[PDB]
Amino acid sequence: LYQLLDGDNTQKLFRTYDGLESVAQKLSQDIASMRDQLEVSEQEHSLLLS
Amino acid sequence: HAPYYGIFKGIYESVRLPLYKAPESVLSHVADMKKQLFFLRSQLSSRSEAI
Amino acid sequence: LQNEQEKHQEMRALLEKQQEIYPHVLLRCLSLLRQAASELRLRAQSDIDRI
């Protein structure tokens, strides 16, 4: 689950459970932030069209 | 009753996996969330190039 | 539910393609109207009417 979330990129000698929850929260925030950026891009495109 | 239940509950709330779901569905759900993130990245790149 | 999620993605991809094409059609129409206004009305016709 940690490998699925953070990839192989972090050579963290120790994986923690707080670290697992943090990377899970980050995936959820990255999806939310990309939806918000897409919605801003839709508004900009709608304003250009108008 | 597992001492780790409080931690996995926080992970399920973070990944938006319902508590009634099978525990084997967790890795498959996170893999589909990563697929969704990659799709939204492609979509934003397309739309920014079109603008 | 799965079929309606697939239909959602397919309609969204079709919507995004039409959103890319529509501004370019409007820009071509604006270009033709600008040519009619600047080259024909303000210049070529104005010179005809003076003479």
**Cβ contacts (< 8 Å) between C20 and chain B: which residues?**
50
* Residue B21 DSSP symbol: S
A12 Cβ neighbours under 8 A, 6+ residues apart: A6, A19
Cβ-contact B50, C19 below 8 angstroms: yes
Chain position carrying tokens 């129409």: C29
Which three-class secondary structure state does DSSP give residue A31?
Answer: helix
Chain position carrying tokens 């319902």: B18
Q: Token pair for residue B19?
A: 């508590």
Of B10, B9, B33, B12, residue with least CA distance to A4: B33
Task: Answer whether B36 touches C (CB < 8 Å).
Answer: no
Q: Indicate which of A5, A6, A40 best probes the interface with B, i.e. most B CBs within 10 Å of its own CB.
A: A5
**Cβ contacts (< 8 Å) between C23 and chain A: which residues?**
45, 48-49
Chain position carrying tokens 């707080």: A18
The C-alpha atoms of residue A24 and residue B29 are separated, in whole angstroms, by 12
The approach used to solve this structure was: cryo-EM
The C-alpha atoms of residue B33 and residue B23 are separated, in whole angstroms, by 16
Chain position carrying tokens 């303000």: C42
Burial class for C32, CB neighbours closer than 10 Å (0-12, 13-18, 19+): exposed
- Chain B residues 6-45 with a CB less than 8 Å from chain A: 7, 10-11, 14-16, 26-27, 30-31, 33-34, 36-37, 40-41, 43-44
Cβ-contact A35, B40 below 8 angstroms: yes
Q: Indicate which of B15, B36, B45, B49 best probes the interface with A, i.e. most A CBs within 10 Å of its own CB.
A: B15
Resolution stated for this PDB structure, in Å: 6.9
> Could you tell me which chain A residue has the CA closest to the CA of C16?
A42
Chain position carrying tokens 């925030």: A29
